[PDB]
Amino acid sequence: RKQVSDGVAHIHASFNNTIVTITDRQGNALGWATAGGSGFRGSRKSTPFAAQVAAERCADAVKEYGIKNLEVMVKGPGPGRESTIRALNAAGFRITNITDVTPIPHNGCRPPKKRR
Amino acid sequence: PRRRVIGQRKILPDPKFGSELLAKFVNILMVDGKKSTAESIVYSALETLAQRSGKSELEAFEVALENVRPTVEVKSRRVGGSTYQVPVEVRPVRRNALAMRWIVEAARKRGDKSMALRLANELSDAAENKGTAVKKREDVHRMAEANKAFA
Amino acid sequence: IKVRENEPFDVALRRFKRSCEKAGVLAEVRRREFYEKPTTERKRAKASAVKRHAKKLARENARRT
Amino acid sequence: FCARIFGPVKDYECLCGKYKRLKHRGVICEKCGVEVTQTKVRRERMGHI
RNA sequence: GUUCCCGGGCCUUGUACACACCGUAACAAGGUAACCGUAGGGGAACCUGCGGUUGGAUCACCUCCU
RNA sequence: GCUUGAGUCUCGUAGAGGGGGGUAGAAUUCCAGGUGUAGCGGUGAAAUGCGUAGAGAUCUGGAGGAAUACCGGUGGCGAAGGCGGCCCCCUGGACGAAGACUGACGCUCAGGUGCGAAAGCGUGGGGAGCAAACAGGAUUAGAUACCCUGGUAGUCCACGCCGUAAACGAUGUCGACUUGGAGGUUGUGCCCUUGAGGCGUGGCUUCCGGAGCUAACGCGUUAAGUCGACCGCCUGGGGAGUACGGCCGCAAGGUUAAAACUCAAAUGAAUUGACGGGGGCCCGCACAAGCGGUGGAGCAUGUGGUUUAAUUCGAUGCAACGCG
């Protein structure tokens, strides 16, 4: 469907979760894959092996669409960012270009808080 | 033990063939220190295995040794903190210290007849790829390929 | 930011991304502000930054080992 | 091309650079014997094997 | 072979200890670093938010370029 | 009367210095629309909540709100506190080449006046994020405590009040004097700034050291070294930097600031041990690879317990149990 070749795989790795959301350049999403939606609940989601399983659940659900020269738009340098882009280049994809499109804030608003 | 980089020592060669592969197999097949009593048995065993195989008393032992000699022995040598086995290519001197150890463990199992005959069975089985001898060698090899990503 | 290279890769090549910041601004906009913190830890960091140069001055005059 | 086998790369100049003093004469680099003398004499440095 | 495990030694870091390791909030990084100032609150220690300082601890490993 | 003191002008630079207003862009909460899934979130773990009323995720348009990654430098400004986009106007303070002068016009303090982070509150507006009181699930014998999801006060703009601190390089202030190095930051004069510099002079700040001080660590031209001028504070700890009173405040309190009694020390620097679920190296069959055993079985021996007319006593983690 959609007659798309430019599968824009938005790989966002928060901290304990690798949620990849394949879409179109327009925004017409195709679906997703996650290190937590495949299992691995715990410090296991924190591992890129789960992110590897993630890039595979994302390697599928596109065999009805047909992405070939795909664009890897990464944001969220958490658990993924490594064995996820490499998993796509190992899943049979000719990535035209891996993009690190990070519209970083100047820390305008105030962010959450963690480990104390 | 923290310093040894020493190899192997000397053993008395076999009083028949110029093969010390056979000479090590006797010291391992013996028990309670009786090597004379044990050596004459290796002879009455090596004959009937070669007799049931198809060749001579020396190649029917080396060709029957390749079917029971691994290449890998996986050992516990970690780099991080997880528990995994590392495929370790072993030295050629220990490779025999793997083959002529299970063949002995074969001569002490399988209640057939005399020792020279039960052994004559298990290595003749190895000569045709079967039995418990060659069986454990298969199992170690399987321990290798399942852990070959950790390098 | 954007790596391409038409054909000689056989690899992802995200080395300029890490050579940009990567965790640089991750570690700065992910948790509570706490305005003063960096200042103090750059303190221990700076004194230990002069310490290796103090080790450079500690290797040039003697070391007759 | 060695200072320990022959001599100072430059006039009273050690191999490692432990002696960048054109006053230092005789004192060797304690790592490897570099007796500091004029590098020009290395047009007369005779060694052996 | 020293990376696993039991005991031992040397060097080193640290202590409001040297009588010598109802609830843990400080002393090892006490496994949540400390104290002052302010408002409020809870059986109570103290905690939460904001500002400052050093009367605080290791910068040792695991993957990549010369 | 004269000048090495204070001070100003001619000629210039830099800056999270302050003040009023306006504006650019990203992210976030949320709203509408197309696509689309059953998980998102979180922690050592679980869970509250949301979900076919379609969340999280993606692209476009957008209104409140607070704050400026990278430039960032034990760097800069200032009495101090404190303070990081840009522009317009206003403007204080610091410093320098070469001259012109009154001629010590200089320093500081009780009563007094002014600034005062953040917070409390009154008032005209506000609420994205975080989040006192509190609610749910857990760690737990217990939670009003580490954690997460919500949430009133506060946070912000403008005017004021109580007028407080580790308001601390803990180093009061004006000034003169006292071998150097690595520097950093901002100007200036001289020589060809041919050139990334050489020789001097001021402000602020960091490290190692001599003189000297010191309990010691160390400070060390920004001093804790040497003097003069001015003020505050201390007489062992606790009581207590607190009650009440003068003065002040709508509220929370603030400033000046004690006693009875008891104890016989309170405190600081600096070291060697004790311990460490802190780091490094090394030794022994500790372990890796194998051989034989106790425990299931038989004989001899021993201890506790039990019992008996009595079935000596001792040892009774490793180091007692074929030991006496």
Author numbering:
A (entry chain N): 12 to 127
B (entry chain J): 1 to 151
C (entry chain X): 4 to 68
D (entry chain 04): 57 to 105
Task: Quote the passages of the study that discuss this structure, keeping the authors' original sentences.
In bacteria, coupling of transcription and translation coordinates optimal gene expression and maintains genome stability. We find that RNAP binds the 30S subunit with high affinity and report cryo-EM structures of the 30S•RNAP complex. We next visualized the 30S•RNAP complex using single-particle electron cryo-microscopy (cryo-EM) at ~7 Å resolution.
Both conformations are intermediate between the open free E. coli RNAP core and the closed holoenzyme (bound with σ-factor) or closed elongating RNAP (i.e., bound with DNA and RNA). Consistent with our cross-linking results, the β′- and β-subunits of RNAP form two primary contacts with the 30S subunit. Elongated density connects the β′ subunit of RNAP to the Shine-Dalgarno binding site at the 3′ tail of 16S rRNA. We were able to model oligonucleotide-binding (OB) domains 2 and 3 of S1 into this density, consistent with studies showing that S1 domain 2 interacts with the 30S subunit and with our crosslinking experiments showing that aa 272 of S1 domain 3 is in close proximity to aa 420 of RNAP β-subunit. Remarkably, the RNA exit tunnel of RNAP lies next to the Shine-Dalgarno binding site on the 30S subunit. The 30S subunit is stabilized in an open conformation, with proteins S7 (head) and S11 (platform) separated by ~15 Å, allowing access to the mRNA path from the E to A site.
